[PDB]
Amino acid sequence: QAKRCTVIGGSGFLGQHMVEQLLARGYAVNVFDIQQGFDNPQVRFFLGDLCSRQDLYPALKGVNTVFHCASPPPSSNNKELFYRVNYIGTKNVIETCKEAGVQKLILTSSASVIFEGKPIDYYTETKILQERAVLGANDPEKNFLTTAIRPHQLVPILIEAARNGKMKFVIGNGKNLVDFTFVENVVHGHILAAEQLSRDSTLGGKAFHILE
Amino acid sequence: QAKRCTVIGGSGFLGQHMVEQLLARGYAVNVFDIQQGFDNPQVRFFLGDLCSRQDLYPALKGVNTVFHCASPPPSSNNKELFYRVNYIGTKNVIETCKEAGVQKLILTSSASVIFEGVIDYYTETKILQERAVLGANDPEKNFLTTAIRPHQLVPILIEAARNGKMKFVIGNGKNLVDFTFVENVVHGHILAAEQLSRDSTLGGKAFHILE
Numbered sequence: 001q002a003k004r005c006t007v008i009g010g011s012g013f014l015g016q017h018m019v020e021q022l023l024a025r026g027y028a029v030n031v032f033d034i035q036q037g038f039d040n041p042q043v044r045f046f047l048g049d050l051c052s053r054q055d056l057y058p059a060l061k062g063v064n065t066v067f068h069c070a071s072p073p074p075s076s077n078n079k080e081l082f083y084r085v086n087y088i089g090t091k092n093v094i095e096t097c098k099e100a101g102v103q104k105l106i107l108t109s110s111a112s113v114i115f116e117g118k119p120i121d122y123y124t125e126t127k128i129l130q131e132r133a134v135l136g137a138n139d140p141e142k143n144f145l146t147t148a149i150r151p152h153q154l155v156p157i158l159i160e161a162a163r164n165g166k167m168k169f170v171i172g173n174g175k176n177l178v179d180f181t182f183v184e185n186v187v188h189g190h191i192l193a194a195e196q197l198s199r200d201s202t203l204g205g206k207a208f209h210i211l212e
Numbered sequence: 213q214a215k216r217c218t219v220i221g222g223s224g225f226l227g228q229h230m231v232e233q234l235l236a237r238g239y240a241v242n243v244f245d246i247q248q249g250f251d252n253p254q255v256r257f258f259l260g261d262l263c264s265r266q267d268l269y270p271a272l273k274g275v276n277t278v279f280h281c282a283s284p285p286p287s288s289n290n291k292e293l294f295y296r297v298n299y300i301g302t303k304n305v306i307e308t309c310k311e312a313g314v315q316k317l318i319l320t321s322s323a324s325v326i327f328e329g330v331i332d333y334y335t336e337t338k339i340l341q342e343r344a345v346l347g348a349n350d351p352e353k354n355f356l357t358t359a360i361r362p363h364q365l366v367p368i369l370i371e372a373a374r375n376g377k378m379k380f381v382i383g384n385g386k387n388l389v390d391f392t393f394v395e396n397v398v399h400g401h402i403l404a405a406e407q408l409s410r411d412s413t414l415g416g417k418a419f420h421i422l423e
């Protein structure tokens with residue numbers, strides 16, 4: 001249960017990758033998704049709508065980390081869907097997380113999220129409200145910790161770095177990172193962030209960007 | 213003046229790439245270095261140590277931007293050389309920059325600077341380099357400064373503050389998707405310089421390079 005996590009959207013492109021590395025790191029992985037993927041024997045697969053408490057709840061029992069990288073496709077231009085799943089459905093993931101005793105939830109956000117006050121479209125708008133819900137939920141004294149990892153027309157090339165000692169960062173070990181592709185990189189950062197969150201609760205409620 | 217600029221350590225691995233790209237944007241480019249490296253028909257080369265007040269002045273005389281990406285070899289293990297060049301030397305670069313009416317200094321720092329108090333002697337001098345240069349920012353004296361921190365214990369993720377305290381720089385990635393790691397690091401240096409002369413409040417800040 002210290003090595004047990006659920007991946008929400010575990011059938012998808014990012015999800016599958018997450019499953020690979022979590023399994024490789026000796027994690028017991030549940031997968032929650034509304035589509036059954038390429039059968040992996042070593043995974044308790046649950047099928048369901050992340051908007052549903054009834055669907056979600058059993059996939060979360062016994063799990064310490066939830067990975068939320070489920071989403072409708074940005075390309076679909078289905079606004080009511082984005083609204084339903086990214087924005088409304090997100091309150092279900094957090095409350096079901098608390099119900100089941102999940103201790104960490106790691107949201108996959110967007111990098112376009114950094115544009116909060118032409119790249120701001122309705123999808124980005126839902127993902128901001130998503131990140132704001134998830135990082136508002138951070139309650140360390142109840143031992144419920146959250147973060148958001150933000151991977152990516154318009155892109156931030158440079159990000160300011162606070163010199164006041166307020167800047168948090170997640171350390172990796174280069175020897176394990178060289179032969180890793182773009183996604184294996186994004187995925188790795190998720191797993192390191194989650195591991196370092198049990199070791200250092202002051203990362204809760206922050207959002208991170210990746211490098212290189 | 214407007215489109216003249218000097219790369220200090222312009223013969224360096226990074227230097228060579230900085231120079232290729234400034235030229236491509238139609239900068240008139242000076243290189244200043246202790247070694248001559250590869251001849252570039254379109255580049256004025258001034259030989260010298262960056263610590264020497266007299267060597268450098270003519271290399272900055274009449275230019276408007278300065279990219280400092282000069283460093284002694286990190287592998288050398290010469291505690292004194294590192295301190296000599298990165299701190300005392302850089303302090304000169306800032307002097308003669310002002311004595312030359314230069315408007316913008318863009319240092320190349322180290323991402324390893326973030327590891328302070330959590331880690332080579334080298335890195336401690338980069339730390340002193342950085343805060344010297346950001347120390348030198350003075351917008352009321354027309355002398356904007358910025359530092360860019362290019363990347364075995366490596367940092368992966370970095371907090372982005374939500375209250376609008378932090379500043380970022382936009383790039384149209386549509387067109388830098390066919391760059392190498394270095395070409396991107398450089399493109400960072402240029403964008404920063406370019407936008408530092410549209411919004412002065414990038415002065416005094418250090419920046420990280422993203423995906």
Ligand SMILES: NC(=O)c1ccc[n+]([C@@H]2O[C@H](COP(=O)([O-])OP(=O)(O)OC[C@H]3O[C@@H](n4cnc5c(N)ncnc54)[C@H](O)[C@@H]3O)[C@@H](O)[C@H]2O)c1
Nearest residue numbers: 009011012013014015033034035048049050069070071072
């Ligand atoms: N992978 C990247 O590099 C990258 C880049 C930017 C953004 N993202 C973010 O990552 C996520 C998508 O990544 P992807 O490329 O793997 O997407 P994808 O479409 O390949 O997979 C997402 C998964 O979400 C699942 N899902 C959708 N609606 C669901 C619902 N109602 N209930 C349960 N599961 C549901 C889908 O079945 C799918 O398996 C989003 O949060 C997106 O903004 C990814």
Ligand SMILES: NC(=O)c1ccc[n+]([C@@H]2O[C@H](COP(=O)([O-])OP(=O)(O)OC[C@H]3O[C@@H](n4cnc5c(N)ncnc54)[C@H](O)[C@@H]3O)[C@@H](O)[C@H]2O)c1
Nearest residue numbers: 221223224225226227245246247261262281282283322363
């Ligand atoms: N780009 C990367 O891969 C990378 C990675 C980590 C950090 N960096 C940073 O990049 C910077 C430069 O790295 P590089 O690989 O281009 O170095 P390099 O060794 O290829 O070139 C640096 C140049 O500095 C010049 N120089 C040294 N002492 C001088 C002096 N006293 N006066 C004038 N010129 C002098 C040298 O002649 C050399 O040509 C460093 O400050 C380092 O922190 C590089």
